[PDB]
Amino acid sequence: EDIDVILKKSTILNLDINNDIISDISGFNSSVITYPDAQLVPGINGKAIHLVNNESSEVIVHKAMDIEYNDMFNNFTVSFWLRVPKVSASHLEQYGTNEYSIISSMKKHSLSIGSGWSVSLKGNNLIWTLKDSAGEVRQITFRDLPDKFNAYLANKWVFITITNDRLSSANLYINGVLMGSAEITGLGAIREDNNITLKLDRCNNNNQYVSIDKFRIFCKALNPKEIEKLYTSYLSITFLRDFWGNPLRYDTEYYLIPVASSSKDVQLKNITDYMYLTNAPSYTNGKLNIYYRRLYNGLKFIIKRYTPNNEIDSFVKSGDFIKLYVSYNNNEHIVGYPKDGNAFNNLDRILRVGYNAPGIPLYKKMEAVKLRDLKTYSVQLKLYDDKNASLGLVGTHNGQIGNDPNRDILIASNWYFNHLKDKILGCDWYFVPTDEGWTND
Ligand SMILES: CC(=O)N[C@H]1[C@H]([C@H](O)[C@H](O)CO)O[C@](O)(C(=O)O)C[C@@H]1O
């Protein structure tokens, strides 16, 4: 059969958010009951569930009749997108050993053992736990990476898939790739609750919160092939994304960082002059084994609309035409290339900030596009001249201008169009907005 078919037909639960209401679109018609404080925020494709630390934030699904016991002995997969702020060093010390769940099928203190499955978080650990009615227990504990800029639980939307083979293993996937496993033969009857509960349980930190989207369950163990398809199916190409996976926006400030050189910030020569990469400061913690380049230094960039013309859509769309500005000192300075302005031999046009020489036209119309790399939250920008000719994608070039040090200078180039299939490319950018989910220790 076809992957898309298989995925469809094995779906037994699918939580869709349409019209600001959470329901089950799988066909089974499971009763969803959202409590007063489950929030609704921006998502991978739509709005997503956002849970805070309290008894009223919660979404409960009461299994329909038909699916009551599909995980008792049989195979099943759980999948969902998950987003979890980056734990601060301080919260690691004080709450590091506080394992709380966020999604569970296990009725707790009541006298029903806890039989069932649970998804839970413990410092920087993501854990899946299975428990049969005799109380036997199998667990995959996934230990996030130490480098927080590149980790799965340091604020970005990530896609989780856990498959359960009762004659063999239980595997845990992150963004389509195996991140952990455990052998689960030796489990007997999974005897859960009739409710699947999304909600922070027993979490000791009043501020903790997490976001979940697309909560789905299949009555089969998905194979890696199916999983990558599942995973890329939610990755809609028409809407651009910020570094955290949320909708790219007009009129908000973003720090630019090059995917190819993610230790680098952009910096500005001077108003009217050029831009270049610099090294991003540091944060390290041997004792907690966590490090990351620090965010929020460098240039602030704001995207404006060039035409008005769709409606107030706050989100940028691939192909929208835009104007880029730098937000340096409460003033706003446009980014462009002045006609016949300094460029490198091969014709790499150097970008200027705030250029205003009387009499010289300034090319400055850009198009925001996604040309490569569907799973990275990165964007590409293409610059045109007044005749709608390409001055090519924005990226960098190494060299010197005057007596200035050798630098990786921001420029526009048509070169990049010939290398769109590479792994790593100089025109790929990360648009980072400041966020409560990430504060630099
Ligand atoms: C010393 C010098 O050449 N400085 C800059 C000049 C002048 O500011 C400009 O010529 C005034 O009209 O601009 C360039 O030539 C230009 O237009 O790209 C590049 C150069 O960085």
UniProtKB/Swiss-Prot annotation:
<feature type="disulfide bond">
    <location>
        <begin position="203"/>
        <end position="219"/>
    </location>
</feature>
<protein>
    <recommendedName>
        <fullName>Tetanus toxin heavy chain</fullName>
    </recommendedName>
</protein>
